[PDB]
Amino acid sequence: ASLPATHELHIFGSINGIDFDMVGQGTGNPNDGYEELNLKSTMGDLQFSPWILVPHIFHQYLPYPDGMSPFQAAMVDGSGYQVHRTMQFEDGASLTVNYRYTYEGSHIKGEAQVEGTGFPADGPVMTNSLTAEAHDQLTEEQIAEFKEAFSLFDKDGDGTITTKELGTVMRSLGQNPTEAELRVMIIEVDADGDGTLDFPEFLAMMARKMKYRDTEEEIREAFGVFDKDGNGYIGAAELRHVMTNLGEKLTDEEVGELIREADIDGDGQVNYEEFVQMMTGSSSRRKWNKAGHAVRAIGRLSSMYFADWCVSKKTCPNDKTIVSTFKWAFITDNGKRYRSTARTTYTFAKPMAANYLKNQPMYVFRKTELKHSKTELNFKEWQKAFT
Ligand SMILES: [Ca+2]
Ligand SMILES: [Ca+2]
Ligand SMILES: [Ca+2]
Ligand SMILES: [Ca+2]
């Protein structure tokens, strides 16, 4: 075969014992990982969230940094590979997907058999209640706390955060973003386009559910900023350092009060679980949250440019096998999380070229978009592989 230009997919099987069957036409660019596919049901309206099909609906399109991926090499060779994927869901549901491909020049003919079982009859999969877009519902007190955090960034008090002000705060916390990085962070959340991050835009950014970044990740990263010496406790001096560097001036008395308020077990330091509880005496709790929200805002702004991108980690147990893993915390209509993990085993008919076995692990970042009716899916994928 040659490198791919066009592909087709027959994806079929059952979810909770209900049969589905879709047939699909697409294209992509093997030089950059791009794919697009149109799928239509042959068996009327889908009875489950098509979001669980998104990873399943063609790594022959994925290049590596300096040449072909092994997937591509196996297509060009003709000998090819087989794919076995399992997904485990937090409700105990499981899905298995097996693929076959055939190649005719630049054309891939793919078939994927999907069997999934154990989905709660009223959960988000069986009720089509998974979405790309949701936000937190904030109370007035939560909005008031975000406004305190916003004020740490708004150094001149003019009611908006500039690149100068965001850079100042990030630098105070040991991060050195470039001006272009600061402009990208702002433009990603700057709804009115003025070049600054105002309080409504700040609130909206903090309330957004990001596809591949959840509360646990943000609170874990925030703890890391406080816990400067990485010993798993925030001490009084570490708390003082974060507060001072953010611009929140505190007396020795106040630092002591904040530690005592958080320090449930009485050892004079704040462990990760005590921190989690603070981030979920009212004036001490509000001061912790002012700093915590500010730290989380920096983490969220820092990470926006890959917000739409999910990482897979690939290794080779031997010269004819790749094992890939990722995790996906789907978002529900009501802005809750629905966690899954995936494990995919690729079996190659011929041994992979030696340089693939040398360059382990590989990390592959994927962006996906799904537009769906009851009968039709429009899918796009963007991919990038890193050593
Ligand atoms: Ca300002
Ligand atoms: Ca703005
Ligand atoms: Ca520490
Ligand atoms: Ca403690």
Residue numbers in the entry: 11 to 67, 71 to 293, 301 to 407
Paper lines:
We successfully crystallized the NCaMP7 indicator in the Ca2+-bound state and determined its spatial structure at 1.75 Å resolution. There is one NCaMP7 molecule in the asymmetric unit, and contact analysis revealed that the protein has a monomeric state in the crystal. The mNeonGreen domain has a typical β-barrel fold with the chromophore formed by 68GYG70 amino acids and positioned on the central helix of the barrel. The Ca2+-binding domain is tightly bound to the fluorescent domain via a network of H-bonds and salt bridges. The M13-peptide of the Ca2+-binding domain is folded into α-helix and disposed of in the central part of this domain. The deprotonated phenolic group of the chromophore forms three water-mediated H-bonds with the OH group of T388, the main chain C=O of R386, and the OH group of Y225. Notably, Y225 is located at the end of α4 in CaM and protrudes towards the surface “hole” of the NCaMP7 fluorescent part to stabilize the deprotonated phenolic group of the chromophore. Hence, we speculate that Y225 in NCaMP7 (similar to Y380 in GCaMP6m) plays a crucial role in the translation of the Ca2+-dependent conformational change in the CaM/M13-peptide domain to the chromophore’s environment, modulating indicator fluorescence. Therefore, the EF hands in NCaMP7 have a canonical structure consisting of two short α-helices connected by a loop region, which, together with a single water molecule, provide seven ligands coordinating a single Ca2+ ion in a pentagonal bi-pyramidal coordination sphere. Hence, the N200I and T217A mutations in NCaMP7 may affect the positions of amino acids in the EF2 hand and in the first linker between the fluorescent and Ca2+-binding domains.
Herein, we report the engineering of a series of the brightest green GECIs developed by the insertion of the CaM/M13-peptide Ca2+-binding domain into the mNeonGreen fluorescent protein. This indicator was named NCaMP7 and was characterized by a 1.8-fold higher molecular brightness as compared to the brightness of the mEGFP protein, which makes NCaMP7 the brightest green calcium indicator among all GECIs reported to date. The NCaMP7 indicator demonstrated a positive fluorescence response to Ca2+ ions, with a high dynamic range (ΔF/F of 27) and high affinity to calcium ions of 125 nM in vitro. The overall structure of the NCaMP7 consists of two linked domains—the mNeonGreen fluorescent domain and the CaM/M13-peptide Ca2+-binding domain.
